[model samples]
Target: TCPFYKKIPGTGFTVDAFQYGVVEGCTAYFLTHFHSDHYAGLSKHFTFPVYCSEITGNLLKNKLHVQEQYIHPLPLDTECIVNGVKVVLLDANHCPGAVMILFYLPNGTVILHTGDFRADPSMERSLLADQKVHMLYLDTTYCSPEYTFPSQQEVIRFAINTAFEAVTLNPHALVVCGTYSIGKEKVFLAIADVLGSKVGMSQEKYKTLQCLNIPEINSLITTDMCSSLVHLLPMMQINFKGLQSHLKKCGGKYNQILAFRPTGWTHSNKFTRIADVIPQTKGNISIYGIPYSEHSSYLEMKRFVQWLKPQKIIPTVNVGTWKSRSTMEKYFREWKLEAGY
Candidate 1:
């Protein structure tokens, strides 16, 4: 359901993953990005060689314990011939080391697989000027209108600067900045840089941030909870049920626990306006859901499709309900359908 393959029978086109002896060996596997759902099954133990970005290759080798001989790391915007197919990598803007891959087939066709992207003007300008993206393996993560939240840049201003001010209002209160296990380090890192205070995290998280190599983000790392007001915790774990029972021993240890879960799902779930905090304090904790997203919104997704003008669009998810190809075509036509082999 997650990984999309595009090896058209005799054609050498490929996407996402590669099998050892599928169809008498495919024409070189191309990696869009290194998300878990994209390649969680056999990434580390793959028998086929993958052409991906340099950072992704590093992550596979260092973190996932994959061998270096399998990954042929390529730099962004640079095109090269791999097994007779010309390919290049473009920035996906989802996370660090994330990228979208474009393939130039022998039939004078260009195929773009948007790994997981937030449609920015820069990407549109770059591709629209030089090349025409023909076939697109679109990332339809937020395909519904419910995902029309603000951009990540707009949300960042509020989450870091405004959120810091909220934390500063009650210095005695313990701050809990919630995020994904590995993603969203930029949120807590920005808050720490502005406050000039240390971030409370386990030794492992500290090392993960250190690998990012950003001085503004990775400068502060402390295990002692008493050292800083901010306690960066996992999103699923950082809640009123959590901080109250875990931190204070159900007592008056701090004035309050300011908790903020920064994600685009906040708006899509509750239909709340962007930048409007739920005022939103729950008991001893002030819960604020900031709209910060890695993937493009439904509104942005449509614009991306229109701009790229791909002839044939492939929905990564929601395949079963689609029933047939014409059904998917009719639906995408409503959004301005714009490709092929």
Candidate 2:
């Protein structure tokens, strides 16, 4: 059952299956992004040729130190034939080098694997848009309706303004934002840009950004803590206890902490508007949980499913249990009816 997600139908290739041991029939491996979840099982000992975008390839080599000989950096949009199967990589819009892979099988069954994407309207206008997809490996992280939050643009703007307001009131306030290994660079960058300040990040994160080839990021990062008011920290450090120690380590240079934990789980459709939401305050620390997500909303997924109209859907996330997998099927059925196909 677990192998279903790894093995691509009618092909000898496997995707994001590094951690599941040596799959019997898999020849070549494909990595959608540099995220840990996608590249979980991959290590230095692996022998297969892994195909990925230029940035992802760079991360593998720089971060994981994967052998340069085995990492194949594939060009985007253009068609490439690997092991007699036509392959294409389109921007996933999730992380820096994330891509939604398209595998055109020998029997003409087009399989679209959405590798953790935030559904953008522009994706529907691509060359493969009108093509009939036989199977869809969907990123169903937020497949349910309740997870619908504001657009990334709106949420980002809200974060910048919220930080601006807090900083204006208290100039000594340190704006610390939560981030993962690859995503959420835009949020902290925007905040630092608006405030006319620099950003502070760990050495590991700074090196990772270097591999992404983000020209603006290098210029914004600084080691001098006093010079930068905005600091990008891990998700765990976004809490009050973390801030208490952080402020203490700063030696009283910053009196207050304004933190933003940018995740989708924070916001729900229950809130009338983002502005009406309140922050969780503890002492001098105020933590704002903004819905700045990298995954597609429920409505966005519905639109994508309806437009593509794949013959069958195989969810890549939240599929561990029978009930969860069965629950997603009903939504696809609803979309199929709505699509009138």
Candidate 3:
């Protein structure tokens, strides 16, 4: 069973109904985003009414295929009442459907839960303008100066350019690149847009993209859209080990395959193995290293914490399990900012 806070000892609060539960009389449950870490346990544990952004609800339905019965979807920046608690959704800028939740409790406590937010100036400025926050629960995944990454646009450009150069150099060799399915769709889109062709996506990706209401990107080439590209085939149909065999079977004429995952070889030594195994017969195989992440960097998190200036900072999600809270604490200490419960 999940842990619960108790006001009394012997007859204390019990979350017996579900794995984890707050007291029945304790207001409402607010979800910061639809990420698995935040919302995965809700189906079995939380039965009371839950609130989140509408986009997040759609994303959950599409990604996890969960049919939640007590979901209250609110639009971005819109205020909604949950057990008399005013809740507002703010853009998280980490993913398409991600959000930061603001809770205006009846007891005069204003809490802001930043769910895996990044320091996207455009997104932050637009979402958090004049809101005065008291308590802040932050996502401090990359609270280290060494974890800095280029902007999303820069990462996209690097991936596209690397793919284009590799493929153009060896038109007869097949190229394969890996990236995240949900977030890297944009990078693939940029590549396809530059090539004036559509990139192929699996049926699952197609459904997810559709549910997110993402615009039909020029890079995503579905089976139905394959007619537009004379040389490309669906990536799902190709086996990674049989790349050479398939190329030989196809007369070794076409040369290029692109794929994406949330996290790939870039994070480890596997990339070198991939580069060695994939044949570059007609042209050399090239793999691009684009640092695209869903978490905020140390500097970004610091900037956010400084800007919000919440009275109390509560680090959630990766708090004690990971280095996020400790990293954030270091930052606060270095900057001489007060930190505690």
- Which sections of candidate 2 miss by over 4 Å? none
For model 2, the run of ten residues with the poorest summed lDDT: 263-272
Residue 134 Cα positional deviation in candidate 3, in Å, after optimal superposition? 1.5
Of 2 and 3, the candidate ranking higher by lDDT: 2
Query: What TM-score goes with each of the models?
Result: 0.84, 0.96, 0.74
Report the C-alpha lDDT of model 2 over 1-341, residue by residue, as the tens digit: 23687679899998888887777878899999988877997777778899999999999898888899999999899899998899999999898999999999999889999989998889988867767888899999998888878888888888888889889988888999888778878889899999998898778877888888788766888766778899888899889999898999888899999998877665355666877767899999999888778899898888888888888899999988999889899899989998897
Taking the tens digit of each residue's C-alpha lDDT, what string does model 3 give over 228-304? 22223244433444444544544445655443332422434323333233322323222334456677766667766
Q: Residue 57: error of model 3 in Å? A: 1.8
lDDT of each: 0.68, 0.86, 0.55
**Against the true structure, whose lDDT is highest?**
2
Candidate 3: clashing pairs of residues: 2-19, 173-255, 179-260, 179-261, 180-261, 180-262, 199-219, 199-221
**Cα RMSD for candidates in order:** 3.8, 1.5, 6.3
Pairs of residues at least 3 apart in sequence or in different chains that clash in candidate 2: 18-41, 19-41
